[PDB]
Every structure is written in C-alpha cells, then in structure tokens.
C-alpha cells in the first residue's frame, strides 16, 4: 500500500546556479528549466513512480538520511537502460544497467533493489537538514544540482531564498520519462522553461531572484532589469490570441498521379 499524496506552496525555493561563471553585483537574466515561484509541489510521506517531464526539483527534510537514491528510465523492466542512483551522504553507486526492478524495491537496515543487472554501459562511484536537488536530462547528459541547508520547520517549506549549486553531470545517454525514490516527508516539484532574473551580490551569491512569468509585476521587473519599479506605466510584453485548432482545405481530387509511366517506363527518351 502507499499513502495518499499532498500539496504545498513552494514559495521562492528551487533556484540554482545556471552556470559556474562567477558574477558579482549584477542582475543576470537566464532562460532555463526552473521551479516556478509559489508553485504547487507534491508532498509525500515515507514513493510511487512519478514522471520526469522536463526535469524534477526534489526536497527532503531529514535528520538521519533515510532517502538515498532514485531510478530513472522509461519502462524500468530490463527492456531498456535505466539509471540507478544510490547517492547517500558521499557514496554514489550510479549505474545504467538494464535493471529488472522488483515490484516494491526497498533497502533494509541489505541491498535488494533490482533482480538483474546486465550490459552496464556506465558506472560511477565516489533542527533538520533540508536537502534540495534538481535533476534533468538534456542531450544525453544527466545534470544534478544540490544544496543542503539547516532549517527549523516541519509544517512547510521555509519562506526565504537559497540557491542550489551544481554537483554532477553523467554521460548516461538514456531516455528518461519516469522516476522513483529509494528509502531505507519529501517534495517533488516539476521544472519548466522559465526565465529568471537573478541578483548576484558583491560576494557572487545569488541572494534574490525574480520569476519573469509569475505575475505582471515580475514581468515589469524583468523588462526593467531591476528589482525596484517606480510609479508609472511600463510596456512589458505583447498579447496574442493563440490558435485553437488547425484547418486543412485541399481541392476535392479523386485521381492518382500517373508517375508510374515516368519512373517505370521501359525506355527513357534521348
């Protein structure tokens, strides 16, 4: 059996560094897969087979490191490569074998996750704590950002700002549509192609961000490339009624083109 789901407001959480270029005292606009501000994150207690879509923001408020790993793939039935990650603390057991996952995989206090592992084309090894992760798969490369912060709250995600560093990039070259978690209160938000306006301070820390599609005020802030908006009226975007459906109108023709006598003639001319 599995517990029913739940929902929570994400506030401003989920921001990561789009790249490793150092920037200080600047407002930088980046189009990337982000977790929209004040989004609707799914809250689970301790793990069904969630989808993956464009990417996944993950969060876990823990005190003993219960959640350890994840599974990625399309069918997860040894018919195609699947990425298994066992990233706990500092030990990682990443593999991309053609695993035959069990009906209800779990880890004891013991390693019983997959029944088979063949053709491993890749293998890599190396107050509460809120561990926040970002996973995506682009151009055959799997990117993982992470950030662990000490917080004191169990009712919901804290109301504040904190950025996620980049940690891992794997050359799995795998199609991922579904994923699941592995255990021995966690949140699963989805990333979307959003534009963000990040604020780097004198020390290069992203201490603030604006979600350019959250609301008209944020659109104004992104258009002005500033976090402060003076009194006035600002042209921020353009409005367009998108099409509802596609219409095709071809002539009512009931003959096949006699291309056989051209491409299949016995004797072509001089």
């Amino acid at each position: 059996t599995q517990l029913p789901p739940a929902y929570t407001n994400s506030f401003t959480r989920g921001v990561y560094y789009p790249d490793k270029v150092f920037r200080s005292s600047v407002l930088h606009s980046t189009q990337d897969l982000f977790l929209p501000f004040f989004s609707n994150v799914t809250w689970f207690h301790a793990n069904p087979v969630l989808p993956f879509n464009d990417g996944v923001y993950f969060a876990s408020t823990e005190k003993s490191n219960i959640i350890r790993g994840w599974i990625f793939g399309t069918t997860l039935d040894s018919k195609t490569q699947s990425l298994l990650i066992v990233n706990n603390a500092t030990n990682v057991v990443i593999k991309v074998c053609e695993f035959q996952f069990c009906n209800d995989p779990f880890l004891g206090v013991e390693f019983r996750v997959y029944s088979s592992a063949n053709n491993c084309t890749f293998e890599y090894v190396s107050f509460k704590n809120l561990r926040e992760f970002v996973f995506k798969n682009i151009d055959g490369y799997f990117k993982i950002y992470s950030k662990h912060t000490p917080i004191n709250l169990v009712r919901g995600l804290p109301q504040g700002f904190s950025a996620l560093e980049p940690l891992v990039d794997l050359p799995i070259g795998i199609n991922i549509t579904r994923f699941q978690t592995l255990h021995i209160a966690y949140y699963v938000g989805y990333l979307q192609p959003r534009t963000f306006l990040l604020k780097y301070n004198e020390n290069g820390t992203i201490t603030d961000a604006v979600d350019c599609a959250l609301d008209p005020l944020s659109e104004t802030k992104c258009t002005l490339k500033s976090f402060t908006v003076e009194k006035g009226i600002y042209q921020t975007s353009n409005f367009r009624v998108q099409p509802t459906e596609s219409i095709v109108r071809f002539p009512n023709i009931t003959n096949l083109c006699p291309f056989g006598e051209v491409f299949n003639a016995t004797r072509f001319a001089s």
């Epitope: 009931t254 096949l256 083109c257 006699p258 291309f259 056989g260 006598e261 491409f263 299949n264 003639a265």
Partner: nanobody, 118 residues
Framework: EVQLVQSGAEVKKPGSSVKVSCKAS????????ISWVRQAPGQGLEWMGG????????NYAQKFQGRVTITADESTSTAYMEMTSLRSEDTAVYYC???????????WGQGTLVTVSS
C-alpha cells in the same frame, strides 16, 4: 519489397457471406489501386472490382455490382472483399492485385480459395 498476403481458404454454405482480406506491406498501399480478381476452376481471370484506399470509392465490374463490397483500411493497410448470398458459381480463387502510382508493375497475392458448397 512490397508484399501482399491474403487470408486462408474459406468453406461457406450457399446463402452465407465470405470476407477475404489482403494485407499489404511496403508503404505503397494508400496510393495504390487494389483490385480483386476471381478465377473459377477452369475459367479465365475475372476482374471483380477495385479501390484506391486514399479515396475509398470502390468500383466494381458490371457482373459484380451488387454481390460484392470492396473496402480498404489504411490504418491497417488491408483490403477486404465481402461477397454475400454466396452461390455455387462463386466457388473460385480470389487474388488481390495492386498497382502503385509510382510503378507500372503489379503486386499479386497468393490467392484465397472460397468454396461454396452444401
């Protein structure tokens, strides 16, 4: 290349109906003319009727105007010939021939024998 495979032989009592299918492989099915040809034992070839699946308007010979219904399904790339009120004279081999609009060659099936007897 292009291949036509028909359903197995049928044995029907007079007054019933038969429906012979003809599956095509090669991707030329939609833009072709699929026709059904009936050969009675000891008689010559006889063109019953044809259809272009892209259009779906069957055309039958004057002798087979009413007792034959020819259909084509592009989604399954299969041409069906359904004959109702089978008579003793309808005991014959039914081939499905095919002409693509890009070639003058013909693609024939293996022939399906339909025996109408009591």
């Amino acid at each position: 290349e292009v291949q036509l495979v028909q359903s197995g032989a049928e044995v029907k009592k007079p007054g019933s109906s038969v429906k012979v299918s003809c599956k095509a492989s090669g991707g030329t099915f939609s833009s072709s003319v699929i026709s059904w040809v009936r050969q009675a034992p000891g008689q010559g070839l006889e063109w019953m009727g044809g259809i272009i699946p892209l259009f779906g308007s069957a055309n039958y010979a004057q002798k087979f105007q009413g007792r034959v219904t020819i259909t084509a399904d592009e989604s399954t790339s299969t041409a069906y010939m359904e004959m109702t009120s089978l008579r003793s004279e309808d005991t014959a081999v039914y081939y499905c021939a095919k002409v693509s609009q890009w070639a003058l060659i013909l693609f024939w099936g293996q022939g399906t024998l339909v025996t109408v007897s009591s």
